[PDB]
Symmetry: D2
Subunit: 452 residues, 4 copies
């Protein structure tokens, strides 16, 4: 190998994190070979003992890759040959290739990683759930187009960010079932002539089944693309929550005060929401890793091509980011203080209660279009006097619609507004309470589905 | 409203496809408002009748958007008012918004669209399986790094493009569970003061459930983004099959001959016969990867709840669907139409000494340690190569020099037919295993199909 | 050809837009064939007249593609042949391919497009500079992390969105050089044995030069890719302006008040006034990055020379261009029509002790190392920042003026 | 600062490569503070001497960041405050933010980076050019759709990968002009109260001009998005070469044989020589497409001025550059190492009846109309020779192509040196 080629081909700086899985795989692979009659017991136990030794020296950082190691696979054979002979050491590559090996290890790594990610997603859900639970009554101006639209419970807004994250958990569970198929046994592409047992080693390493096609099992990286999708969808959902927090932390909003432990200053007297901003900017990053991996998987002729080595770094970088991001966001969310007096004073500002007036008129029998019309004449009636809709006189109420009567006042508060909306998925506290329970059960239900 | 404003906001050129869905939804919501006491029976049956009338005039092309119309939503209410007057038709607005209306229409539209997409995937899977079945014995050099590695059955190679596409159907089924939550009754964002029933209208419209959070049901577009992923992935899986066909179709390879009906000619070169279907699919895989990235970018950093940005969710998904709707049957037809030159694939199958692995595995069966069987194989390859013969034609002395363990019984494994048959484990290229693999593909497709009908 | 192949191969539905470029190039090719002694004057004039008829009828809506026309090129040959006969109509096709042809028509289209985009980009710059000129001294809280940081002049903030666009305009000038190379006369991929002339036809069709490599000029699509990036970059530049407008317009900020004619409402909440223009701009920049990414994936791993794949060059560039063609004037209209709430901005400018930094920077001018009343006013504070590019009014008026001169200089180079 | 917050905020694992540049600029900033009478000479020399000691300790590597250093900026302040004490090291802080510094530093870093990238591109053109030179007359079947279309010179095909790369070089020059604008002294966002001089420090630091708008200079990241585009276009350009090479190397093609030193093999298949470099080129174009698209997604919808998001500008660009720095010398090498099997290519050149176009083109010169048309030029040598216009595959034409490539390459090389 030339200089340039070694530098390009060298992968130990990112793939070393596969080492432990490579050893566990090799150990179960030893058993398959011995059970097919291709190793003496003693050749078996020699390798078992060389490997346990090598897992030890790896775990504590005593064995590491040399500069002259191309990849995790070559380096652990340096260290295994060091431990048992070259003759015994080399027996271990019978009936497997670097191709089925790498795919499998990458799957075992990633099946753990989604669970680590899953742990973090539940943190943020629990953190949002907690905050919503501690504010069962705080009313804000609910937004569409960032304009005051209707008053809602802070809790209902807040849980609207938990619901997507749970769907992401649902996706992890969906992903992991496709993830749990082992290519160990496929060798380079066609299988082995030797008498191995793909199903046994698949059981050992903890997959659900072995692949039905050796070519497909070594070539396809759709499982990696799907993971990459799922991690991007999580980061994008954090980006939505981050946008909210950032804007909420502004001097102009003043909805939240940031905690010092979860905020940052400047090189003078600023409290910035760095964590939220980094979640946001990183969502862009993890869209890149996904888009780029698909581009890489594109137009790949069967079977394995070296191109496919590029599957890992994108997924690795995606999983790392979320491993930093989720605990931070959960912390940041947990640490938020809400300025409830500030949120409520705004809740009706912009005459958000106009729609309650129009819906009131529908209940008396006015066609929506005309009630909508009447609501607007009243918004102007109120606006021009610096007053709230509730404070319109009976007479000026009577001028807008004869159907408008003093009893409509009894629905022009933000408290009554939020409460009227008690259909499934509405912002009435009774519904938010049930919604909050459902999240509890979905979280737990999903957690258990992952433990299996 | 200014022309500029109005020209940008106008969405009828793409969103007119949701019109049946809109009309159907308004039928269910007519019934919801009635059950809550907010229409007399008169008014109910007047709306029902006017929606029915409007529905037929849309279906056949008498009613269509005008330039005045901002969205299909504006369009249908124009012509509903025309059919039943301004008093009664304007009542339909009660308890709902464009925000919930549109999330639920695009959902409805999409569930059908993956169903159609799924039918097309199933086709391609069907054409791969059929050719696999028709050529159960054809042997080829299997490739890695597009270099000949070990012999494989064409059937085996073919079916490897089926399993990804069955995983994408799986992904479709998974997607649809999440797609089946209705936003109706969420109104602009908070839900409604009126006494509607979201569960009822959810059931009426084919959904499995109503949403648990109005703000979320109206703001979230993760289902759309997911849709785009499944399509993207389906297009990339098609790109893989595409690359192979294109390569196989070269003069150099000569693995397949393209059919006239499934290939295109040149406008200055008389005798060119190109694989354009494969090539367009490869091309459009980039395209559909863009629509997904772009979609997720648009979803990035949305503050809750609805924002006009979310309009941009439909076009990329529509595009990805329309391209798959073209591409799938075309590739199924392409695959089905191919002729395989089995003599060409076979003469190349042992070439570059692909049976080396077989030789070395044979020594491993005699108890020779693999790294040593490797070196002996390598040595056997050169021994034959310089003489320009097959491994089989290594003479007994030649074989004995390479290794004392290597006796002339090795010679009865150095055939492409033996090589291929020896891989009898689950997954392998042996014909008994391909036969089972082909049954599984059959059962899995049926199973996947039946859960899409539910 | 099967039904499915015909449905898949057909591109008339989007490439029709190249029809008039195809005719201008057929005219120029007629001359190239004629000059090389491959046409009589009778034949030449027969073709020129047929091409003129067709062209007049194409612009009329009298002539359009048909269901069984595969592309713009087939469609137009059919119509020339109706007009001038199958014999004389046969001759144009000589020495030329769909490959060199389609690549060249697309370049000519892309070069008019980028100018239309340049016009709209300038308008937004102009809309931005008009508003600056109309608020020359107003002071706002200057933001980073969307947190109040230092006071700045509104004009400074507004022009901070113009420079990005001036730089995008710069990119269009750069692009256009790489763009102005003609593939005409490279045929399929190798050139023609017929005695054509790339240079003459290049010059006839407004290009700076003919291509130096026939294989490369028919295969390469990096010009398309560069266009997608520049348009994607314009959309994101727009999207940063969009985010500021949207937030500015919230009840909570009340920095600006949207104008009735440039905002839309709500079907149920009467009184809404949404910045739909800003919001669509923001959303569409996503779409347009997506167009870029996807175009690059299409180009990736493409063996030479031409592949059917390279038909996907067009539609994404077409969409980007269409979107910017809608977005650009809308956003300029949104920006011209804002009302700025100057007083509400002046209240908040000192809010959060943004003037702390001005105190600490007074400690420095009086000895003490960077630790911690003439400059504890927002007027004094902004006036202190009078180096180049700072917020001082002196510099903003010179900057506002430089913007005017940069804009026109970049305008000059597009007409050339 | 919570553990979580610090974990996330930490930048020293990637932004430490900005340390040399950070130091070079603090030097030029000590001068700016001094010329405005905000430093004494004994102070000014204290710092310069302190910013000298710290530059050497960074260079040989005795000074690096601690676990607690948020970033390269903090780290270098800590090291300076260690060398010249807390009081003096603090003065250097005045009239600058982390905002304008990182903008500037990244640009300095990037201008260096594109120069290194450009050198590798030139290497890859050189390689291609060399192989044309060595195969001046070899004829192969020219392909469109990977179907044999018309015969061309191998030289004509090879060089067709060179023009793209030259155009990418052209984009680098065009890029560099926008890159060469300094934000120094624009501050957090508003410019500085203190009498600094942006134009002078820009010049100290090798920039061409100081920025016209302080909000813009500190918040805009289009320069980074341009760079990412250019890198991703280069990588896509390389993947098109890479695809050719991979397909050529197949047994079926036999167009090229791979070299052992620019080849990799199999742990379980002795005969195997693979095109791993080509294949990693290909795979990594996907990756660099990713970094561009993501970066743009990151820059999308940023309100003015600086936001923490903008920290994400560096890692994807660092990565893209990192990858081309490994892939350019490896590809140039792969290309130079290759054995072209000219006999094999020549056999195939007329295969598929590729000389039919020539047939039709001859009877066109016999007055027959083309569209009906479908031995001097029924040879591949005659066929390629006839295509003698600018751009064609005619021998004397490729030779002129090839000398134009060498000149354009050096012309473009000159402009990077300015
Ligand atoms: N080399 C190879 N696969 C790559 C090993 C794993 C690689 N580092 C990756 O990450 O994809 N494939 C075999 C050779 C082998 O088994 O080592 C081939 O098909 O030639
Ligand atoms: N107008 C609006 N959304 C439009 C939905 C249809 C649009 N084509 C889309 O799909 O985004 N939102 C409401 C107004 C309304 O309820 O009509 C708002 O909150 O202001
Ligand atoms: N399909 C094709 N040429 C380009 C068609 C242009 C296409 N519609 C597009 O828009 O890119 N085939 C050429 C021959 C030709 O038709 O000119 C070939 O096989 O080399
Ligand atoms: N306000 C700030 N914290 N600015 C820090 C600038 C450096 C930051 N790590 C970046 O690269 O963007
Ligand atoms: O620390 C800085 O220089 C900037 C901080 C900020 O803009 O918040």
């Amino acid at each position: 190998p030339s200089d340039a080629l070694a530098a390009l081909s060298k992968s130990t700086h990112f793939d070393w994190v596969l080492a432990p899985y490579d050893l566990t795989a090799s150990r179960a692979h030893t058993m398959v070979l011995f059970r097919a009659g291709l190793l003496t017991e003693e050749q078996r136990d020699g390798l078992l003992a060389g490997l346990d030794s090598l897992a030890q020296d790896v775990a504590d950082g005593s064995f590491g890759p040399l500069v002259t190691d191309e990849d995790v696979h070559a380096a652990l054979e340096r260290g295994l040959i060091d431990r048992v002979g070259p003759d015994l050491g080399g027996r271990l590559r019978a009936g497997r290739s670097r191709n089925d090996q790498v795919a499998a290890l990458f799957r075992m790594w990633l099946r753990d990683a989604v669970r680590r990610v899953a742990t973090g997603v539940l943190d943020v859900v629990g953190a949002l759930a907690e905050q919503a639970a501690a504010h069962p009554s705080a009313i804000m101006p609910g937004k569409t187009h960032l304009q005051s639209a209707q008053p809602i419970l802070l809790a209902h807004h807040l849980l609207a960010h938990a619901h997507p994250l749970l769907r992401d958990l649902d996706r992890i569970v969906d992903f992991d079932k496709r993830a749990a198929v082992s290519p160990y046994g496929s060798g380079a592409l066609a299988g082995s002539s030797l008498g191995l047992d793909p199903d046994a080693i698949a059981a050992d390493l903890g997959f659900s089944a072995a692949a039905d096609n050796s070519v497909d099992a070594t070539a396809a990286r759709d499982f990696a693309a799907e993971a990459a999708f799922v991690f991007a969808m999580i980061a994008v959902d954090l980006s939505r929550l981050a946008e909210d927090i950032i804007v909420w932390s502004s001097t102009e909003f003043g909805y939240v005060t940031l905690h010092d432990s979860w905020s940052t200053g400047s090189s003078p007297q600023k409290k910035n929401p760095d964590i939220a901003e980094l979640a946001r900017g990183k969502s862009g990053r993890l869209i890149g890793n996904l888009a780029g991996l698909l581009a890489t998987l594109k137009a790949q002729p069967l079977a394995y091509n070296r191109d496919l080595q590029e599957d890992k770094e994108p997924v690795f970088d995606s999983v790392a980011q979320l491993e930093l991001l989720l605990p931070a966001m959960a912390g940041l969310v947990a640490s938020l203080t809400f300025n409830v007096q500030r949120m409520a004073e705004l809740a009706p500002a912009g005459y958000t209660l106009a729609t309650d007036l129009a819906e009131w008129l529908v209940r008396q029998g006015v066609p929506f279009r005309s009630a909508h019309e009447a609501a607007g004449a009243a918004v102007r009636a109120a606006e021009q006097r610096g007053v709230g809709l509730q404070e319109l006189t009976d007479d000026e109420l009577a001028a807008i619609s004869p159907e408008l009567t003093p009893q409509v006042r009894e629905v022009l508060t933000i408290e009554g507004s939020v409460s009227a909306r008690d259909c499934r998925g509405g912002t009435a506290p009774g519904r938010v309470a049930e919604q909050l329970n459902a999240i509890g059960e979905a979280a737990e239900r999903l957690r258990r589905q992952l433990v299996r």
